[PDB]
């Protein structure tokens, strides 16, 4: 007898068990949107030094006597001549202290156009993303612990409100540092809602629905990134698009006010009166009451007592420390490479919307392929495979000259697809590998190191001035090493599912 018994007494397929899950996962579309958002908001259009206003722009020669051309015959980025003609009848070059001139051919006005984040102090564009992802990690840690201390419904409400207000005020942000701090807060809320969605849905669902939750969250993630593709194709302005992707959290908060708190959390909290009230409420919503009437305070008291009865021991055990380090390094490398790949599309030639939608399309076949390979051949060999193909994709995309477009785009598409497959594979392997005692904490540690890698990804990508593609070189080098280390670890095709620390050496 456990909570699964009383839940199956209520059900697990009823109207509540579908409406609650679907509403709660509905904002994950915009979660994916916000995570990708900097890519469509921080695009750098072609730009050049603004000629000084004192000199005439028509009779003096035009727009060519001040701006030296580049290697490809395009105007220089952040440099100009002091004088149109240097004839005797000092310094000749000069940075654009009279501002820059952009083009509104494709992108009307983005952040780099609004605040001139080019050449000197151009790293602020990547700094914004890095600080947003720092906020993501800080939220996933502190807000998760606060939720464990207090609950899930109130924490979700706070996450919704914080995300909505942070998005709106970031859209209407006067100064750069204000925008960056607003991104910090937005990530703080967004990671918390992202993790708490999965934890609440896994808590309210029966034992035989974890795979359903996983496939649903993957489908919603892919559809939401497709939704960003569509929205970007709709509105080009960064303020208008930011508000469009920030408002749906604000509206969804209204109907979010009617969530049902986790009965399991209430039982683990030690109080059962509100637990019984919650089961009565869900029975009323599920439309059944004769069977739920027998539910009394002593009924679940006699049902939920077996389960009722961290890091230091995680690092103390040598074998456990080793496998934890390997697993967490895998998480770090995978997330870091994935966000390094997906954050950059400037050097793809093709339109942003088309590459985004084809990225959306590739994910579902990748999910099917990963499920087939894990259910037919195995999980580990598929894992090192996916890393090998992803790494080779990234290196060959890096070395191949920018002139080639179709091959580069298709190869990046394949890399992203196999990387998402590797993401599903690593999540499944981590879930099915760790002993049940530290399984949840192990998932948390893997997620935190993945967030660390995602944090350092923009930092690495910032160093594009040293060599135009060595960020791609590092992005492709990291998961080759990740595959190399993952080549050595115990295999779980015996379905052991260990429950005690003494069992890991038994399998290996």
């Amino acid at each position: 007898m456990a909570f699964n018994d009383l839940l199956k007494q209520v059900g697990g397929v009823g109207r509540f068990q579908l409406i609650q899950v679907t509403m709660v996962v509905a904002p994950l579309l915009l979660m994916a949107s916000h995570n990708t958002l900097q890519n469509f908001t921080a695009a750098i259009p072609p730009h050049h030094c603004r000629p000084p206003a004192n000199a005439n722009l028509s009779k003096d020669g035009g727009l060519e006597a001040w701006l030296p051309l580049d290697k490809q015959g395009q105007p220089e980025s952040c440099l100009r001549f002091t004088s149109p003609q240097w004839g005797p009848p000092t310094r000749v070059t000069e940075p654009c202290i009279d501002g820059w001139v952009y083009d509104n051919s494709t992108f009307p006005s983005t952040i780099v156009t609004e605040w001139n984040l080019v050449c000197s102090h151009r790293a602020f564009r990547q700094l914004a993303q890095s600080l947003y992802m720092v906020g993501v990690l800080l939220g996933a840690m502190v807000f998760g612990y606060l939720a464990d201390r207090l609950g899930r419904r109130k924490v979700l409400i706070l996450n919704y409100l914080q995300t909505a207000v942070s998005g709106t005020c970031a859209a209407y942000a006067p100064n750069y540092t204000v925008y960056c701090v607003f991104r910090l807060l937005s990530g703080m809320s967004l990671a918390s809602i992202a993790i708490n969605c999965m934890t609440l849905n896994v808590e309210w669902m029966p034992i035989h629905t974890r795979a359903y939750v996983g496939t649903l969250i993957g489908y919603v993630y892919s559809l939401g990134q497709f939704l960003l593709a569509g929205i970007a194709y709709a509105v080009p302005h960064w303020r208008h698009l930011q508000l469009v992707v920030s408002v749906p959290f604000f509206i969804a908060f209204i109907y979010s006010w009617f969530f049902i708190e986790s009965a399991r959390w209430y039982s683990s909290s030690g109080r059962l009166d509100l637990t019984l009230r919650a089961l009565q409420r869900v029975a009323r919503i599920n439309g059944k009451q004769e069977e739920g009437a027998k539910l009394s305070i002593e009924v679940l008291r006699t049902s939920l007592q077996k389960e009722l009865t961290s890091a230091m021991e995680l690092l103390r055990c040598p074998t456990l420390r080793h496998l934890f380090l390997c697993l967490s390094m895998l998480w770090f490398a995978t997330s870091f490479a994935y966000y390094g790949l997906v954050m950059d599309l400037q050097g793809f030639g093709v339109s942003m919307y088309l590459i985004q939608v084809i990225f959306g399309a590739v994910d579902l076949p990748a999910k099917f392929v990963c499920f087939l390979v894990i259910n037919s051949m195995g999980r580990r060999p598929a894992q090192m495979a996916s890393l090998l193909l992803a790494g080779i994709c990234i290196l060959v995309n890096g070395i191949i000259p920018k002139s080639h477009t179709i091959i580069r785009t298709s190869l990046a598409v394949l890399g992203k697809g196999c990387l998402a497959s590797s993401f599903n594979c690593i999540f499944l392997y981590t879930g099915e590998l760790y002993p049940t005692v530290i399984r949840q904490t192990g998932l948390g540690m893997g997620s935190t190191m993945a967030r660390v890698g995602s944090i350092v990804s923009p930092l690495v990508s910032m160093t594009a001035e040293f060599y135009p593609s060595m960020p791609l070189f590092i992005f492709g080098a990291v998961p080759v090493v990740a595959s190399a280390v993952t080549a050595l670890l115990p295999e779980t095709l015996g379905q052991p599912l260990p429950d005690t620390v003494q069992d890991l050496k038994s399998r290996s």
């Binding site: 003096d60 020669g61 035009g62 060519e64 006597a65 030296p68 051309l69 580049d70 290697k71 015959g73 220089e76 440099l79 001549f81 149109p84 003609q85 240097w86 004839g87 005797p88 310094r91 000749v92 070059t93």
Partner: protein, 115 residues
């Protein structure tokens, strides 16, 4: 410092060939960007041709593509520029820079196309 004295100024009838070279110092002819620009009387100083570092490539102008030749010489640290079938509008004061944007600019050499 760096010297960029250029020589080759003269008056030559159209269709002739004139070799222009800039005397550089303090750097190699294959270690930095090298370009020669022309400033016609009353026109704007437009880029003509360039030579990258370590012979990465050669570029020319739209109105000068297949009209002139840009060559370098690492032995004397100079770049020899020669043109064939000079156009009547090609008469301009030529100059050389030290990179694609650099603090060093040539003194300037004036050439005449005449007829």
């Amino acid at each position: 410092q760096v010297q960029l004295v250029e020589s080759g100024g003269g008056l030559v009838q159209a269709g002739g060939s004139l070799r222009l070279s800039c005397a550089a110092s303090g750097f190699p002819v294959k270690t930095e960007w090298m370009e020669w620009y022309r400033q016609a009387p009353g026109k704007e100083r437009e880029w003509v041709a360039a030579i990258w570092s370590y012979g990465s490539g050669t570029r020319y102008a739209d109105s000068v593509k297949g009209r002139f030749t840009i060559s370098r010489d690492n032995a004397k640290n100079t770049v020899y520029l020669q043109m064939n079938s000079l156009k009547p509008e090609d008469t301009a004061v030529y100059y050389c820079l030290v990179r694609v944007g650099s603090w060093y600019h040539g003194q300037g050499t004036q050439v005449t196309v005449s007829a």
